[PDB]
Subunit: 243 residues, 3 copies
């Protein structure tokens, strides 16, 4: 179980076995919600398309892919112990919210993922990153995970796009793995939630497989109704669209 | 302890003992919120007036009562192995929503309540039956309970109307039992209190009423004027007796 | 440990220890949200300024300060067995909502807090007190706590104003302790909650120490980012101290 350099909080690695049980083989895996990368990091496709709306994430990812050593070194500096108090965190939050340089921002992004309350990633209405200090014991610099991610990223393209656009890049050689924000028990709406399904139906008819993960509820069974459904242990659901 | 042919609200009928404990005697039992029918099914008044606002329900019950053998036969057909899969479940749900045949609707309805997610009854904004496939091991066709219902229905009338109208059918020899939709932790709080206000009117005319709900500040507020009884278990449940 | 004479649903008491551990020393302790009085009852300042938005409360307190026995006498009369029923509760409550006499009102207020659902203080939108009968097996008359409250009162001023006014009164020799309505998961707002933390910034900046207590949250940590913070497990409580 290769870990992700980022917290989500990470988040977790349940389901992983089950996702791989039902994930069908192919050349290229297309992920319209990469998030922390956990599935990508734990699979062996020849080739990966990975997308997400959060541009801070994609930008980090391309940098880790293209400038690995220079990235690791600049990031490492600010895991020294002088930077582990409320006074520094807030100064670094502000710098990040005011920076226009993508590189510097990716370095600071890392530190905030690791020193901030529960590894949350959150913006206020002015679109500033607005998570407070976590008061963490001893954070951990993820040097190995960084390198491991960048080796793997050499067969990965990353795009800042929403699900319909990333989903439109699959072809017959592709498989598609979907991890939308969870159905309920701004944000991602139910209209979008049902829209993802239709896209899935559109793709499977074109002979491209699609697997979707979500809570098990009334709404999701409605949405995923034209798919093979496996329940797993609230319960999770894995909707498979096999041609 | 007789069961209802329809899968109930959540899981109920452990309250039946406290209901029968606190339910006064008389000739007729009026039930403004009949639902699946279990108080009716496990009680013994000489007649019943049974009401509900869902007209799929009241139709079904009028057809179980008046066309009993033809209904049971036709329904049993649908409870096979062939029909226990999404493909068919969805096909039958669409038929139901498109149909104009009260008979055939009553049929599909039971299948949908048996093969459907948590045996729920729900409609979307367009008024169409809305519950997804329930993925059950193998569903049980309620043959005995269908007949029990039908035999018991011979002393019943079914109405499709609202708590206020059904409650005004009650009279000197009546007794009212209400089982409104649950208070919170759509049926509005204004109606929730209206129900307790009509109860207060009934008892002034010497017509006992008993009402059932969760135990909360609000239920307690609305039923101020009834002797109150708390039933444990997951939270407590309240029974409010208005007695002359 | 002294108890308040007023009931409350779920706390103030559990944390006194942790609080007194972190409460700075000084001559006067100021309390924007006095509530039931428990830190005030269990600390030993020279003088106290005690404040709350609820006029019924401050008024009750001023009356207990100045008319002790005349108060305790009238209040005892209502803790008899003849009163522990819904007939009487609703009667007393209605008299409270209709009385314009402070003294009669404050005697009733105590009946309502000890005989009502969960010791709760609520009002409808017409300002009427709307808590129902709490159906209590037997309610205590807190005589000892009343007298103890009166005794300490001699070193206190009660004000009915809002958090900012009452904090504007703190001075070189003061300590402020804040216990706002809790952060979430016509009431106290987020903006207000963030405003309290600012006034606190201003106060420490003038060498006035401030202690605030709340749940441990993403939100409470944002607001109190400038305080020295201490989690206390029991979700967790947060204590934020602004020390010069
Ligand atoms: N409209 C959208 N199109 C494409 N991607 C979208 C869209 N809306 C939201 N997303 C992205 O979808 C991702 C959400 N994912 C994971 C988010 C995430 C995990 S670790 C991490 C670290 C940094 C940033 C985000 C994340 C949520 C799935 C999980 N089952 C849950 O409900 O919590 C997240 O990256 C978010 O940015
Ligand atoms: N204004 C109304 N007047 C009379 N009846 C009403 C009114 N509004 C709603 N109702 C009906 O009241 C019935 C409610 N029943 C709910 C049972 C139910 C839910 S889905 C279903 C399918 C078949 C049979 C019963 C049920 C009361 C039980 C309990 N208090 C609860 O809701 O948890 C239900 O049939 C609904 O259709
Ligand atoms: N804006 C305000 N300014 C001053 N005081 C305020 C303001 N807003 C609310 N308050 C007062 O703040 C008091 C808060 N206290 C209420 C304590 C109480 C105990 S017994 C009793 C009987 C009557 C009234 C209050 C209480 C609750 C804080 C807690 N952590 C929570 O949210 O549950 C409460 O009495 C309320 O009247």
């Amino acid at each position: 179980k290769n870990r992700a350099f980022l917290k989500w909080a990470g988040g977790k690695y349940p389901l992983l076995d089950d996702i791989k049980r039902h994930l069908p083989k192919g050349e290229c895996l297309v992920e319209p919600f990469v998030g922390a990368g956990s599935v990508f990091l734990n699979t062996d496709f020849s080739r990966y398309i990975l997308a997400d709306i959060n541009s801070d994430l994609i930008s980090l990812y391309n940098i880790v892919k293209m400038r690995t050593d220079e990235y690791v070194q600049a990031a490492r500096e600010l895991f020294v112990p002088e930077t582990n108090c409320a006074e520094v965190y807030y100064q670094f939050r502000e710098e990040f919210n005011k920076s226009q340089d993508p590189f510097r921002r990716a370095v600071l992004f890392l530190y905030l993922n690791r020193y901030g309350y529960n590894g949350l990633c959150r913006y206020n209405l002015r679109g500033e990153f607005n998570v407070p200090f976590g008061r963490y014991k001893k954070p951990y610099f993820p040097e190995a995970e960084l390198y491991h991610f960048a080796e793997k990223a050499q067969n990965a393209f990353f795009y800042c796009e929403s699900y319909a656009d990333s989903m439109a890049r699959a072809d017959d050689a592709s498989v598609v793995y979907c991890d939308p924000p969870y159905a309920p028990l701004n944000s991602f709406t139910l209209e979008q939630q049902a829209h993802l399904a239709e896209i899935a139906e559109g793709l499977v008819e074109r002979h491209i497989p699609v697997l979707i993960s979500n809570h098990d509820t009334m709404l999701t069974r409605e949405w995923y109704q034209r798919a093979k459904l496996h329940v797993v242990k609230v319960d999770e659901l894995l909707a498979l669209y096999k041609p």
